[PDB]
Design a protein around this ligand. Sequence first.
Ligand code: FAD
Ligand code: NAP
Length: 308
Amino acid sequence: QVTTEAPAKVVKHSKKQDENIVVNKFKPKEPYVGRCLLNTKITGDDAPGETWHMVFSTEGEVPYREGQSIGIVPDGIDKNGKPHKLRLYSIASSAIGDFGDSKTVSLCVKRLVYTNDAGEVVKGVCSNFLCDLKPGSEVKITGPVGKEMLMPKDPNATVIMLGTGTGIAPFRSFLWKMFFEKHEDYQFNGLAWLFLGVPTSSSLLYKEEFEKMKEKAPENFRLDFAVSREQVNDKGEKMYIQTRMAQYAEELWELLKKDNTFVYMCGLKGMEKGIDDIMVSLAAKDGIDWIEYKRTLKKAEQWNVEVW
Ligand SMILES: Cc1cc2nc3c(=O)[nH]c(=O)nc-3n(C[C@H](O)[C@H](O)[C@H](O)COP(=O)(O)OP(=O)(O)OC[C@H]3O[C@@H](n4cnc5c(N)ncnc54)[C@H](O)[C@@H]3O)c2cc1C
Ligand SMILES: NC(=O)c1ccc[n+]([C@@H]2O[C@H](COP(=O)([O-])OP(=O)(O)OC[C@H]3O[C@@H](n4cnc5c(N)ncnc54)[C@H](OP(=O)(O)O)[C@@H]3O)[C@@H](O)[C@H]2O)c1
């Protein structure tokens, strides 16, 4: 008698792809050092700001999956002569990545530039270090990190994706896996519906990639852009992400009632309310309380949010 079945720890059931998930492999103390293979501006010269897509080599060292983030420890020192604290960035590439070999990682980085009260133009530390990275240079990477935006296991589920600006990053990751890759253990066949809000057309992130997936899966991939400074509804209101969702209020409410519908929200801290505003009205008209309904959705792993 050499064996025993040690009693199992009690565990919550999960609908998301967390099987053998990896978080916090590399710490800022000793980050994985990769290199920059390419770094391109993906917004027009005309856009209000600059967003860049960049790919780093990882030689397979960083075991990330769709929906996770990696931290970056930007080179240099702060005003006190101290090395910089890491900043987190949602991975914009699928687990197999942009080269199909499972040895790289991609980011979608908005260059932060503003002017303080004093009137001085200020440059965010990490965002400007990253957008200025030249192919060949090293970059310090930490993580992976995150379990909140992991994709649902069900390959026939409906995945509604709501993102603003760079919040599109984990959705580019999910979609490459769903429409640009043939996975033996995962072939997607549900409905993938993407809503992206950006300020101008020159600001539309990965439009062309999204347009190829639509051309490749015209049935089950739906794409809706919400260009706030160029589009307007019948009332002349700026087309924000929730203003565009409102044009499909009936259909979305119906899917929200299906049990295999998972909703993901990523991007600006504020997008959150406009959406809830849109939701309460719908549920209301159906004699349902969004407050209560939302709770269930969240506990049911169907209303996933990651905003900054
Ligand atoms: C989980 C997670 C995922 C993220 N994903 C991404 C991503 O994919 N892409 C991306 O670009 N960002 C992402 N971020 C944000 C990112 O981590 C950094 O916060 C961002 O890049 C700015 O950092 P920085 O080092 O450039 O700026 P910092 O040097 O840290 O400066 C930021 C500070 O400047 C001030 N500030 C910022 N904006 C303004 C403004 N408009 N006016 C006045 N003061 C201001 C604030 O005090 C702020 O704390 C994510 C954040 C989190 C938490
Ligand atoms: N995992 C994460 O947590 C994660 C990942 C990626 C990014 N982010 C965060 O999300 C943000 C994306 O930054 P970004 O500069 O790329 O955004 P952005 O370019 O400034 O604008 C995004 C769009 O959202 C609009 N918008 C503003 N307020 C809104 C609201 N209340 N509801 C709906 N839409 C609204 C803007 O319209 P107007 O300009 O006309 O107002 C604009 O069209 C960053 O702050 C970043 O920190 C977080």
